[PDB]
C-alpha cells in the first residue's frame, strides 16, 4: 500500500545513492550493482569510441509504433545471426537505448516499456544460454568493468 510503498521507495533511494557513491570509488553495493555499472560504462565506452558509426546507423532509424517491433527484431536477429559475444551484447543494449531515446523524441513514449520487454525476452530466451556457458555476467564484469 501507499505507506509500505513510501517506506520501500525511500529504502531504494538510499540504496541507489549509496551504490552510486561506492561505484565512484571502485567498490560495489552488490554483484548485481557491479553488473549494472559495468554495462552502463561499457555502453558509454561503446557509444563514445564508435560515435560516428553509432550515430550513423541510428540516424537511419525511422520508427513508427506499427513498425517498431519488426525494426527491433530484424536488427537484433541480424546482430546475432552468426554468433553471440560480449561486444555484440553491449551493442544490443546500446541499440535498445537508442530506440528508446528516439521513441521519446518522436512522442512515441509508449514504445519505451515495450522495447524494454522485447529486450528482456530476447536476453532471457536467446542470449542467456551463451552467457551461462561463458562464465555469466560475473565474467562480463571481469572483462568490461
Amino acid at each position: 500500500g501507499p505507506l509500505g510503498s513510501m517506506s520501500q521507495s525511500n529504502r531504494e533511494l538510499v540504496v541507489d545513492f549509496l551504490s552510486y557513491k561506492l561505484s565512484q570509488k571502485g567498490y560495489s553495493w552488490s554483484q548485481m550493482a557491479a553488473v549494472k555499472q559495468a554495462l552502463r560504462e561499457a555502453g558509454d565506452e561503446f557509444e563514445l569510441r564508435y560515435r560516428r558509426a553509432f550515430s550513423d546507423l541510428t540516424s537511419q532509424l525511422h520508427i513508427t509504433p506499427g513498425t517498431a517491433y519488426q525494426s527491433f527484431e530484424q536488427v537484433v536477429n541480424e546482430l546475432f545471426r552468426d554468433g553471440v559475444n560480449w561486444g555484440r551484447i553491449v551493442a544490443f543494449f546500446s541499440f535498445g537505448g537508442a530506440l528508446c531515446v528516439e521513441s521519446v523524441d518522436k512522442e512515441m513514449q509508449v514504445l519505451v516499456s515495450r522495447i524494454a520487454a522485447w529486450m528482456a525476452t530476447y536476453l532471457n530466451d536467446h542470449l542467456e544460454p551463451w552467457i551461462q556457458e561463458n562464465g555469466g555476467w560475473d565474467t562480463f564484469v571481469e572483462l568490461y568493468g
Binding site: Y50, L57, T58, V75, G87, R88, V90, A91, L143, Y144
Partner: peptide, 18 residues
C-alpha cells in the same frame, strides 16, 4: 545496413576487451 554496422562495431569492441 544498420544491423551490419552495429555488428562490425560490436566485434571491434569485443576484440579490444575480450
Amino acid at each position: 545496413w544498420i544491423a551490419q554496422e552495429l555488428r562490425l562495431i560490436g566485434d571491434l569492441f569485443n576484440a579490444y576487451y575480450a
